[PDB]
Design an enzyme around this catalytic site. Structure first.
Site, PDB file in Angstrom:
ATOM      1  N   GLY A   1       2.105   5.924  10.499  1.00 36.00           N
ATOM      2  CA  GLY A   1       3.528   5.820  10.201  1.00 36.00           C
ATOM      3  C   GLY A   1       4.161   4.529  10.705  1.00 36.00           C
ATOM      4  O   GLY A   1       5.326   4.251  10.409  1.00 36.00           O
TER       5      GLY A   1
ATOM      6  N   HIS B   1       0.804  -1.216   0.000  1.00 35.41           N
ATOM      7  CA  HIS B   1       0.000   0.000   0.000  1.00 35.41           C
ATOM      8  C   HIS B   1       0.842   1.273   0.000  1.00 35.41           C
ATOM      9  O   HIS B   1       0.262   2.347  -0.135  1.00 35.41           O
ATOM     10  CB  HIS B   1      -1.093   0.038   1.092  1.00 35.41           C
TER      11      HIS B   1
ATOM     12  N   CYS C   1       3.201   1.478   9.840  1.00 29.68           N
ATOM     13  CA  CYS C   1       3.070   0.433   8.824  1.00 29.68           C
ATOM     14  C   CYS C   1       4.438  -0.067   8.391  1.00 29.68           C
ATOM     15  O   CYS C   1       5.375   0.731   8.262  1.00 29.68           O
ATOM     16  CB  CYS C   1       2.247   0.922   7.632  1.00 29.68           C
TER      17      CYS C   1
HETATM   18  O1  LIG Z   1      -4.617   1.708   8.808  1.00 31.49           O
HETATM   19  C1  LIG Z   1      -3.763   2.492   8.406  1.00 31.49           C
HETATM   20  N1  LIG Z   1      -2.767   2.978   9.189  1.00 31.49           N
HETATM   21  C2  LIG Z   1      -2.514   2.719  10.557  1.00 31.49           C
HETATM   22  C3  LIG Z   1      -1.894   1.561  11.034  1.00 31.49           C
HETATM   23  N2  LIG Z   1      -1.708   1.258  12.326  1.00 31.49           N
HETATM   24  C4  LIG Z   1      -2.149   2.122  13.229  1.00 31.49           C
HETATM   25  C5  LIG Z   1      -2.791   3.344  12.911  1.00 31.49           C
HETATM   26  C6  LIG Z   1      -3.261   4.253  13.895  1.00 31.49           C
HETATM   27  C7  LIG Z   1      -3.862   5.424  13.528  1.00 31.49           C
HETATM   28  C8  LIG Z   1      -4.017   5.749  12.186  1.00 31.49           C
HETATM   29  C9  LIG Z   1      -3.581   4.901  11.207  1.00 31.49           C
HETATM   30  C10 LIG Z   1      -2.966   3.664  11.533  1.00 31.49           C
HETATM   31  C11 LIG Z   1      -3.764   3.029   6.973  1.00 31.49           C
HETATM   32  C12 LIG Z   1      -4.300   4.461   6.915  1.00 31.49           C
HETATM   33  N3  LIG Z   1      -5.772   4.441   6.982  1.00 31.49           N
HETATM   34  S1  LIG Z   1      -6.583   5.661   7.703  1.00 31.49           S
HETATM   35  O2  LIG Z   1      -7.965   5.503   7.372  1.00 31.49           O
HETATM   36  O3  LIG Z   1      -5.921   6.876   7.350  1.00 31.49           O
HETATM   37  C13 LIG Z   1      -6.397   5.406   9.452  1.00 31.49           C
HETATM   38  C14 LIG Z   1      -7.610   4.898  10.236  1.00 31.49           C
HETATM   39  C15 LIG Z   1      -7.374   3.492  10.786  1.00 31.49           C
HETATM   40  C16 LIG Z   1      -8.539   3.057  11.643  1.00 31.49           C
HETATM   41  O4  LIG Z   1      -8.770   3.978  12.718  1.00 31.49           O
HETATM   42  C17 LIG Z   1      -9.112   5.277  12.207  1.00 31.49           C
HETATM   43  C18 LIG Z   1      -7.992   5.853  11.372  1.00 31.49           C
HETATM   44  C19 LIG Z   1      -6.402   3.836   5.803  1.00 31.49           C
HETATM   45  C20 LIG Z   1      -5.766   2.503   5.489  1.00 31.49           C
HETATM   46  C21 LIG Z   1      -6.427   1.640   4.615  1.00 31.49           C
HETATM   47  C22 LIG Z   1      -5.880   0.422   4.259  1.00 31.49           C
HETATM   48  C23 LIG Z   1      -4.663   0.060   4.783  1.00 31.49           C
HETATM   49 CL1  LIG Z   1      -4.000  -1.503   4.390  1.00 31.49          CL
HETATM   50  C24 LIG Z   1      -3.971   0.888   5.649  1.00 31.49           C
HETATM   51  C25 LIG Z   1      -4.521   2.119   6.018  1.00 31.49           C
END
Ligand SMILES: O=C(Nc1cncc2ccccc12)[C@@H]1CN(S(=O)(=O)CC2CCOCC2)Cc2ccc(Cl)cc21
Ligand SMILES: O=C(Nc1cncc2ccccc12)[C@@H]1CN(S(=O)(=O)CC2CCOCC2)Cc2ccc(Cl)cc21
Ligand SMILES: [Cl-]
Lengths: 297, 305
Positions: free
Chosen positions: A135, A41, A137
């Protein structure tokens, strides 16, 4: 004495962490030999997105040094960036896929820099209850056996409940998750029964015996009770795996199951076990044996 | 999201761990530049431990009596000196893996990571706190002496603890890296016991602010308290007194969540009175006191949920 949630020493993994930037996205990569592994991603039709990229679009930074990308390919949900320099700090390693209930250490990173290490378990619903911010990931999960690092997890995303989802190092997700912004939710979770039993044996080893009783149970009767409290079924393999701890403490596995049954039906009654008011399920039988024996790496 | 007991990455410390043998005793040493630091009780027998005269035991030793092993390599001891309860072994090779470091003495309530070692080999890493009674609730077996506690804020390793002994209650006692013990303990096998322990109030408050940042507010109430009334209640539950320094230290977390320190104190008083009633806070059924205000700011997001 003492019983802590203990992680493996992280040094062999710290020397592999790099920062990967593609356009506006910055995340972490794992540099082993001449390949940097990171979530796909960082770039949806991922082949259509990837075909439009050239090697120079991927910026890889190892400390204060820029690594040159000379090739790229995708394997499931993992991107593999061929670099011009082999990591001189590459440890002896394997890529392993773990099962739910198994534990591992997580080296949480931001911008290719390790910030913390913690221990956790793959939940029965394939999520992990981690501690991650934006950040993080590309942060990885691992175990160590002698001098070999076994990489088992790469962080990809957070679910709406605050729990985390990711893949093995071959890019295959743990659980029915997909790498994209869409409606996904963690399934109903269960307690890892074999791990709670191991933790009760660790409490006995550390001098906590108030929960022990004279009773025993059949595996069938225990499983009928455990199903009612959202506990994972206990199999004969679990009973066999707990054999050493049973022999050391003198308490048979089904004798300890009768203790667990009474704890589920009656609670702790103002008491604690190893400083906890809840039944702990993130120590495997092997973790208990290792921490109560002092195995080194 | 999420809140874990998080330790610092241990790599910078692993590259400093060595094994120290003197006669029949084997323990761990910390190799920084050309000096190996280890507990002075490495020169003792179990008999000596009742009333050891370390100065008399040390004067009888020569450099070649101390065997230092760094991995598969034998280091050569070229000098030795005692500083309080630590032995400093001058060696002929400087550690090429010596990180940027400081020796810091911490106060009760402070947290640190412990790299538990046996035979100069690291076996595990965990996070813990200096209890108000100056002991640590660690996880250590025989041979763990010389294992160290540290913090790595930025790229400098701050060494704050060296493991020396296990007390009768299963708790651990040790020194700063200048050999001064934390607490009224002596590196002697004399009748010593940990004092009554208390809960680190400022850390429980920080952890309640971390729960609010992560989206949980069920424990909040409409009340406030004076600092004096809070302390009168807190002492009844074996909680450490909360000082004006603690209130000042919690200022940033108060500003971020919009909850005044004495309003959060009112919530704590109510939790102490009522218990959790089948509920949890950050996955815990007990009030957690091993995260400092600084740990909460470091781990948690800057945006409240
Ligand atoms: O999850 C993801 N990142 C993260 C990873 N770990 C811990 C996080 C903590 C806080 C924010 C991001 C985090 C990303 C980014 N996001 S996002 O929508 O910007 C973040 C959301 C995640 C759920 O809680 C609300 C905020 C969409 C996304 C879509 C698909 C994939 Cl594979 C990755 C991702
Ligand atoms: O504490 C010490 N070592 C250890 C250190 N840490 C964790 C241990 C766990 C288990 C066994 C040793 C451990 C040493 C040796 N011992 S000892 O008698 O082996 C310790 C007792 C403690 C209660 O359980 C039974 C063993 C006396 C002693 C006296 C003074 C000093 Cl400075 C050091 C020491
Ligand atoms: Cl301090």
């Amino acid at each position: 004495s003492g019983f802590r949630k203990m992680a493996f020493p992280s040094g062999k993994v710290e020397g592999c962490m790099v920062q990967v930037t593609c356009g506006t996205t910055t995340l972490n990569g794992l540099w082993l030999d001449d390949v940097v592994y990171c979530p796909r991603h960082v770039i949806p039709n991922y082949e259509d997105l990837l075909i439009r990229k050239s090697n120079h679009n991927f910026l890889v930074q190892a400390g204060n040094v820029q690594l040159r990308v000379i090739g790229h390919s995708m394997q499931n949900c993992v991107l593999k960036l061929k670099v011009d320099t082999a990591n001189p700090k590459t440890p002896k390693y394997k890529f392993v896929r773990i099962q739910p209930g198994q534990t591992f250490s997580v080296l949480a990173c931001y911008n290719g820099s390790p910030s913390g290490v913690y221990q956790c378990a793959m939940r029965p619903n394939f999520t992990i209850k981690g501690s991650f911010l934006n950040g993080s990931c590309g942060s990885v999960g691992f175990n160590i056996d002698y001098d070999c690092v076994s990489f088992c997890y790469m962080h990809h995303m957070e679910l709406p409940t605050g729990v985390h989802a990711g893949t093995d190092l071959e890019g295959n997700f743990y659980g029915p998750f997909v790498d994209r912004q869409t409606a996904q939710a963690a399934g109903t979770d269960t307690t890892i029964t074999v791990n709670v039993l191991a933790w009760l044996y660790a409490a006995v080893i550390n001098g906590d015996r108030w929960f022990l009783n004279r009773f025993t149970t059949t595996l069938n009767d225990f499983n009928l009770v455990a199903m009612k409290y959202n506990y994972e079924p206990l199999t004969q393999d679990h009973v066999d795996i707990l054999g050493p701890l049973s022999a050391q403490t003198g308490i048979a596995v089904l004798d300890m199951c009768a203790s667990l049954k009474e704890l589920l039906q009656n609670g702790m009654n103002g008491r604690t076990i190893l400083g906890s008011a809840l039944l702990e399920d993130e120590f495997t039988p092997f973790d208990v044996v290792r921490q109560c024996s002092g195995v080194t790496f």
